[PDB]
Assembly symmetry: D2
Homo-oligomer: 267 residues x 4
């Protein structure tokens, strides 16, 4: 197994279409022992994760909660056993209030809303590294989920801005993590049909935004030399696992693109 | 004159070493009629700007103040005269609480501090465009000040993250501005010895941070094929003026580097 | 005038739709005194340039000819007068054999053809700098024409590869030029309907390539926040002039995008 | 094993310090069945590769030889057995005549020399893909070796230009390879003390170039958050193997950096 013997914390599961659900599944398939964290709806998350190939402890983590973050390392240690540390950490957490996305004008997002989204989507990558690095082994790996923000695009609006901050945060986390012998990287994924993504295509954030995201997805598959299947999160789960393994040991502060090769092609 | 007949709003003057002071001076030298905005210490700013080659109205603008932003367009119109619009806008505003910079550990910056810095340094670029676009002429130009955040670096910490967000904001502002026939760009400048920069070199944010910033500056000049003079803001003021002129009419959502060519050289 | 008193060498005029024709026209409009170089069809080029607002000496320059390059500085000095030097140099030269473009398979371009195209399109930027730097004044500016090659695209094939090499050459030329107090930069332009471009849209390199280039152009204008007019080379001529002026004095080894802002927008 | 059952062609072994020697070793350690290609000194290469953990057929391949390339697919099929195809291809080939590197002035490299280096170092990536794609399985992977050319640097000169072309070639190869269900990527490695690299540090290309390369290496390790060991090629061999595996299945036309994280850090 690719991750035999590794202890890995996976955040961000909320449904069975969550990217983190598939990261967790593939990780277990490859021999990893997991600890999960979940936000708010813990009964739902437990029920969802019962479907994973192996059992895994579920800890509550609201990334905006200082107390949750302060106690996290202790709770993880309790879950995996004193004297054991984590080898891997997956950050698969993102959020932006509706005012910062969709057909709501870019200029009309109130800073308080933008700031909440940047807190959850970018700052929390640093918050989690701070909480967990003291309990990680040398050779460890921290991975977060990215959506390539190097160009602006319709609809994504302030979430794209938050991803830009996240990529910058990642390079700083790499500096800190390096002192523990730990890597920090992002996986920039193509669009994936999660429940939220489907809602948006279905017009949940405005018809115009729905149409733009649908077009975005179609152009993505078209220019990807090996195609892109927005209904299949497995290729991104495998990529996250590659970064958690020992097979990219000299890569840190970096971004790995699991996007079908769309970002390197113009037409 | 390069800017003959143009009406230009310049924010960000606080002392005579402010980059915006030099932007304003060169702009006036090239025929621009200016409106200035200042934060907090208005008597100081008025006294400082009395030294500019021509007179210019000074309006108060706290970029975190909704009321200031809501009234800004009216106050500018009053200052330049009904029926006249702006041709140019300069955003030269940046701030990050001390906890987000220097030898204070990256992980120890509290989100409230980071969020204030991102508000002032990144979000406010959008806030100003929102306030001013309704009073800009086609062919107009909005320019903000950037410090290349594509790589992480010691000491700059969360301010670098804020610049990353700003570059992302700029690309979105370009989309909105385009509808008014207005461009939006950033000038990424080399390090400039402002009062704050001198304080930091002098150890104001920790000796270790001071030493790193001093080394950063020295390597900058070394690899710049035409050198870099951190004591001379004129080359960046000229670059900002180039973007306010009619001579880069097909450039928008972009970053122009006024850095001596340091960023394109490795050693 | 923007270029009052400047002596500028402009290569690359072959017809009145040549980008270099418009660079030359705008430069003269702004007070520059020009020396032109032309390849092969000198009688045609003289006849074409008679239409420029002012007269300008025409020197022959085949960029693949060592003798032409060896004698170039002397011939320019003769044309502008002993004791005078150039302030500006415009490289607007590009070529790729048909086998390296269009519907001819990428893999089927013979190296001899690719190498000719890279010689003319990339290496010659260095060849010209070598020839002319000894006769340039401090504060001088060398500018070449680029087409953004950071992503692959249909039809452009090996010409895109040649532009990639050119951008790399430019950064090295900046290093050498810096020793003379001279800048070196590229202008990455949007697609322009030159005679060759029209021929290709018209199917000259295959119907499939024609269709792709036409689609490329249409998407370009669509995502450009201020639009893109492929029939109007003036916005790029103005940008080249901005780089030849004294208004971007701290930019070197760099790329300025005159593309309507298309490259910074995804959809 | 990571590459159990995979048939992989590895070019570029010339000594036991060759990066390709270590790629081949790790690949065999992970269950790959190899076919090797070698240039010129075949007796030397056979003797060197006898030290690999398993036996592997050695085919001659001069990448500038049309006949070698024309017959390559047949010779590989003969070596691995009719009805079997390759799952992987490693391009670890690079060369630049001395005139294009070191203290020899950048401007003094004759085009014939530059063109030879670009032929071997960049064009041949396409030559090999053309030869081998007809004998690759869906899900296959082509990998080439890169040295990050995004910024200019002392000494590397025209080899850096050749790497720039190579990165561009890679994106085009991805387009062609995609039609076979095959990926194409580069690994951008940190500096590695091969025999040639040691010779250069030792002054083989000029004392000034030796000093610059030594400084380059030292700064590399310094800014790498997890360090860089130029004497250890294993971390890059592992990275190449990661790309040959099934664990980055949605990455193509891309560059993976195995550089200790040096390129994402400024100081
Ligand atoms: N779906 C896509 O097209 C796509 C593409 C690229 C990257 N991503 C990124 O992948 C990551 C996972 O998103 P997803 O698409 O799987 O959506 P998702 O809704 O399934 O998962 C997002 C998770 O973030 C959690 N979260 C929100 N606020 C939180 C907080 N305060 N504390 C802790 N957790 C919180 C939610 O509970 C949820 O579990 C996100 O960072 C997203 O931006 C998604
Ligand atoms: N100095 C450098 O090395 C350097 C390099 C690149 C970019 N920059 C950028 O240039 C810009 C100008 O900075 P500077 O170096 O001239 O420093 P400065 O201190 O002279 O100017 C910063 C200005 O921002 C203003 N400001 C802070 N909070 C504000 C708020 N709430 N509302 C309105 N204004 C507010 C201050 O009053 C001050 O006038 C900044 O964006 C800075 O990041 C500086
Ligand atoms: N047209 C576009 O869409 C576009 C877009 C971006 C960049 N560019 C670049 O702009 C530059 C000018 O091209 P253009 O579009 O004006 O086409 P053009 O045909 O009008 O000009 C190209 C010039 O290169 C010259 N040339 C070819 N081989 C030469 C050699 N051996 N020695 C000297 N000169 C030689 C030709 O004589 C011609 O004058 C080229 O580098 C081109 O790649 C063009
Ligand atoms: N050593 C480094 O610091 C470093 C760093 C990054 C990337 N790289 C790249 O890694 C690759 C391998 O280089 P290396 O460092 O292992 O050096 P090396 O000398 O060990 O290997 C280079 C190989 O290229 C082969 N070659 C040269 N001309 C050829 C031709 N005509 N046909 C077929 N093969 C030919 C040589 O025989 C040799 O086997 C190169 O592409 C190099 O640029 C090296």
């Amino acid at each position: 197994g690719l991750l035999d013997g590794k202890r890995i914390l996976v955040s961000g599961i909320i449904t069975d279409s969550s990217i983190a659900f598939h990261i967790a599944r593939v990780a277990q398939e490859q021999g990893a022992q997991l600890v999960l964290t979940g936000f708010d709806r813990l009964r739902l998350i437990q029920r969802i994760t019962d479907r994973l190939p192996a059992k895994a402890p579920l800890l509550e983590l609201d990334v905006q909660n200082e107390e949750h973050l302060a106690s996290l390392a202790g709770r993880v240690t309790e879950a995996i056993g004193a004297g054991n540390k984590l080898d891997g950490v997956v950050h698969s957490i993102g959020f932006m209030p509706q005012t910062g996305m969709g057909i709501n004008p870019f200029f009309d997002a109130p800073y308080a809303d933008v700031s909440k989204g940047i807190h959850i989507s970018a700052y929390s990558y640093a918050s989690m590294a701070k909480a967990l690095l003291p309990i990680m082994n040398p050779g460890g790996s921290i991975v977060g989920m990215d959506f390539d923000p190097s160009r602006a695009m319709p609809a994504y609006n302030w979430m794209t801005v938050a991803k830009s901050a996240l990529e910058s945060v990642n390079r700083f986390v790499a500096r800190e993590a390096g002192k523990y012998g730990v890597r920090s990287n992002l996986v920039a994924a193509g669009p994936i049909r999660t429940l939220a993504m489907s809602a948006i295509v279905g017009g949940a954030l405005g018809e115009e935004a729905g149409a733009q995201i649908q077009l975005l997805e179609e152009g993505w598959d078209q220019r990807a030399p090996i195609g892109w299947n927005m209904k299949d999160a497995t290729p991104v789960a495998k990529t996250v696992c590659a970064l958690l393994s020992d097979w990219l040991p000299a890569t840190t502060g970096d971004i790995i693109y699991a996007d079908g090769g769309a970002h390197e092609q113009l037409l």
